[PDB]
Amino acid sequence: MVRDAYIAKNYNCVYECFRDAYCNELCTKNGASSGYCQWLGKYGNACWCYALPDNVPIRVPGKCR
Amino acid sequence: MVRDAYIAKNYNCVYECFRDAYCNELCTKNGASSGYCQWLGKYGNACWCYALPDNVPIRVPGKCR
Amino acid sequence: MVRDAYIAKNYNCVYECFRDAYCNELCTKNGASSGYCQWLGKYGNACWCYALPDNVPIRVPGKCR
Numbered sequence: 001m002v003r004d005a006y007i008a009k010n011y012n013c014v015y016e017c018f019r020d021a022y023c024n025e026l027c028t029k030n031g032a033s034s035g036y037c038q039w040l041g042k043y044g045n046a047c048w049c050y051a052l053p054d055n056v057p058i059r060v061p062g063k064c065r
Numbered sequence: 066m067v068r069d070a071y072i073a074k075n076y077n078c079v080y081e082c083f084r085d086a087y088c089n090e091l092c093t094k095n096g097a098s099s100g101y102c103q104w105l106g107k108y109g110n111a112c113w114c115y116a117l118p119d120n121v122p123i124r125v126p127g128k129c130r
Numbered sequence: 131m132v133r134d135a136y137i138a139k140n141y142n143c144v145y146e147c148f149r150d151a152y153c154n155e156l157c158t159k160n161g162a163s164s165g166y167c168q169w170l171g172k173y174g175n176a177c178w179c180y181a182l183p184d185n186v187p188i189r190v191p192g193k194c195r
């Protein structure tokens with residue numbers, strides 16, 4: 001299954017960003033259809049991916065550790 | 066079927082917004098993959114949903130009533 | 131197959147834009163689920179389409195000619 005989400009890294013942490021292309025490269029390398037750099041969002045300036053496969057971790061409620 | 070669209074409420078009216086998370090919560094609660102708050106768009110500052118199921122009303126050409 | 135991409139015109143050139151609705155109309159007329167006007171991106175201010183069918187050309191690495 002796929003989902004639109006903030007791609008995460010160890011452990012439960014978003015990827016920050018400035019440029020859309022940075023996030024699109026990151027997200028698509030990880031199987032998403034595309035992604036972009038969301039500014040001033042829930043997790044600050046962070047990468048949002050569309051249709052990211054569920055073998056890739058995502059940000060969920062809770063702490064980044 | 067699903068479509069990308071402005072989610073609507075009675076009758077043929079968009080949801081205004083400030084924050085992306087507001088729209089993402091609204092859109093996903095209604096079955097969309099995600100959504101965001103479009104600023105300065107066709108209907109002002111309004112929620113846009115990706116892959117919103119067709120059992121949820123959307124904004125179509127015409128008046129909000 | 132579909133892909134998220136910059137819709138292109140002859141030859142390997144993006145469509146520039148100001149308004150999201152301009153790009154959404156262009157992209158959806160060409161079979162995409164939606165599109166928007168990306169500002170200050172890889173190709174300047176240009177139209178990005180979601181789920182654009184592969185019978186529509188897209189921007190790929192290289193020169194616009």
Ligand SMILES: CC#CC#CC#C[N+](C)(C)C
Pocket residue numbers: 036101166
């Ligand atoms: C300023 C600004 C801005 C923006 C944006 C966006 C988007 N998509 C990727 C959700 C369509």
Ligand SMILES: CCCCCC[N+](C)(C)CO
Pocket residue numbers: 018019020036037038039169170
């Ligand atoms: C007003 C200028 C907008 C450029 C910033 C674009 N983002 C990187 C925030 C795309 O979501």
Ligand SMILES: CCCCCC[N+](C)(C)CO
Pocket residue numbers: 039040083084085101102103104
């Ligand atoms: C230039 C700062 C951008 C933050 C606004 C982001 N929106 C809420 C308009 C996202 O589309």
Ligand SMILES: CCCCCC[N+](C)(C)CO
Pocket residue numbers: 104105148149150166167168169
């Ligand atoms: C800060 C105001 C944002 C309006 C510009 C929106 N775009 C046309 C860049 C949408 O991506």
Ligand SMILES: [Cl-]
Pocket residue numbers: 012013014043064
């Ligand atoms: Cl985080």
Ligand SMILES: [Cl-]
Pocket residue numbers: 037038039040
């Ligand atoms: Cl943004």
Ligand SMILES: [Cl-]
Pocket residue numbers: 041042084086
């Ligand atoms: Cl927020």
Ligand SMILES: [Cl-]
Pocket residue numbers: 077078079108129
């Ligand atoms: Cl309205």
Ligand SMILES: [Cl-]
Pocket residue numbers: 102103104105
């Ligand atoms: Cl916007």
Ligand SMILES: [Cl-]
Pocket residue numbers: 106107149151
């Ligand atoms: Cl408009």
Ligand SMILES: [Cl-]
Pocket residue numbers: 142143144173194
């Ligand atoms: Cl170009």
Ligand SMILES: [Cl-]
Pocket residue numbers: 167168169170
């Ligand atoms: Cl943008």
Ligand SMILES: [Cl-]
Pocket residue numbers: 019021171172
């Ligand atoms: Cl760039």
